[PDB]
Amino acid sequence: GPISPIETVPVKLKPGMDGPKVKQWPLTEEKIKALVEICTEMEKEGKISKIGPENPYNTPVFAIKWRKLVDFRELNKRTQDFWIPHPAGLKKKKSVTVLDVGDAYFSVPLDEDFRKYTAFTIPSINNETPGIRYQYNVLPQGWKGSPAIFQSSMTKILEPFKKQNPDIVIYQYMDDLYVGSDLEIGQHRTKISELRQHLLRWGLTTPDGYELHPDKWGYDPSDLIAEIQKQGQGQWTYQIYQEPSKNLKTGKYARMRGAHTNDVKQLTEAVQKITTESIVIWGKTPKFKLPIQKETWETWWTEYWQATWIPEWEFV
Numbered sequence: 001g002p003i004s005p006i007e008t009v010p011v012k013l014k015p016g017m018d019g020p021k022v023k024q025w026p027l028t029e030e031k032i033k034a035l036v037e038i039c040t041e042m043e044k045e046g047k048i049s050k051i052g053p054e055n056p057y058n059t060p061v062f063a064i065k066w067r068k069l070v071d072f073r074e075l076n077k078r079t080q081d082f083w084i085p086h087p088a089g090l091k092k093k094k095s096v097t098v099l100d101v102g103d104a105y106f107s108v109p110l111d112e113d114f115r116k117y118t119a120f121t122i123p124s125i126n127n128e129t130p131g132i133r134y135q136y137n138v139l140p141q142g143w144k145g146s147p148a149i150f151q152s153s154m155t156k157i158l159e160p161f162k163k164q165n166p167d168i169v170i171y172q173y174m175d176d177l178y179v180g181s182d183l184e185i186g187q188h189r190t191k192i193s194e195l196r197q198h199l200l201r202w203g204l205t206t207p208d209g210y211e212l213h214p215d216k217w218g219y220d221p222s223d224l225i226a227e228i229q230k231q232g233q234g235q236w237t238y239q240i241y242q243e244p245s246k247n248l249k250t251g252k253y254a255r256m257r258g259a260h261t262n263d264v265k266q267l268t269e270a271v272q273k274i275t276t277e278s279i280v281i282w283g284k285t286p287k288f289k290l291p292i293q294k295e296t297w298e299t300w301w302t303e304y305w306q307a308t309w310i311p312e313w314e315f316v
């Protein structure tokens, strides 16, 4: 749908910070084609615009039906802060459905003076020739500012559902809603559908959600660390903690060998599951320590990464 110019909100970088300049890594010809197709459609719809030679910023993109993912980590660090509470009962619910509500953002303009800092490049084959440069004209998915700016509209949209379903907990984290109830699974799913239809009535398309059942699964609100380690061979272990001695949670996953898997793919799965669990339990995304070289991770992680968010991580 079309945007409303009066919903443009002024935004800026943190004092004395410039915009991001993180280079586009090489992509496969398949991924480049997909990005060209996606970006040609976004441009036709006014959501991005080609930029000229003056703009010096850059944020990396990649492709994962294909979807474009932007790694806004550096822009997010440089973006101003914005002036939710996590329900302790969300993890006690029989079911929690996660819904991606990032589609909302395409309908909301981005401050024209901030657009330049969202510049990105569709790379050429092997990065041999200059790529195709674009910036965002609307709130971008994965950008810190987008859920903050949309919160007032999200609240107005959710209000009738919340008023009619007091037994349902709705917690928002970044670009997702976590919808929790103790209903029979069929009844819970019906409430999810009613919620998706409400969102859609207001122009918010959502993917099918993914279902958690966390009642089958000393925190200090002031950073979370998740460490994954190799346990011999054959399985993975992880520790979630803030101070080194006391763990808050520990767990295991299998480290399987096969023609369709590898350590990076499995580690990305584990990162996504530990993150989701951490958001549910504590409302925080951990920083990760992964049992792999940075070079091998930096090489391959984008090949399997299905999340719209991207956490911070260290290595051996």
Ligand SMILES: O=[N+]([O-])c1cc([N+](=O)[O-])c(O)c([N+](=O)[O-])c1
Pocket (backbone or CB within 6 Å): 021, 022, 023, 024, 025, 055, 056, 057, 058, 121, 123, 129, 130, 131, 132, 133
């Ligand atoms: O990847 N990059 O960071 C990047 C950046 C610029 N630039 O103007 O700041 C480019 O012109 C290109 N380029 O044209 O391929 C790439």
Ligand SMILES: O=[N+]([O-])c1cc([N+](=O)[O-])c(O)c([N+](=O)[O-])c1
Pocket (backbone or CB within 6 Å): 023, 024, 025, 121, 122, 123, 124, 127, 128, 129, 130, 131, 132
């Ligand atoms: O397409 N590209 O994103 C691209 C990227 C880079 N770079 O170093 O990141 C280049 O140097 C060139 N290049 O040299 O044309 C192109």
Ligand SMILES: O=[N+]([O-])c1cc([N+](=O)[O-])c(O)c([N+](=O)[O-])c1
Pocket (backbone or CB within 6 Å): 023, 024, 056, 129, 130, 131
């Ligand atoms: O291909 N290029 O012409 C090119 C140009 C610029 N630039 O800022 O003028 C870059 O930053 C990059 N880059 O960072 O890859 C590439």
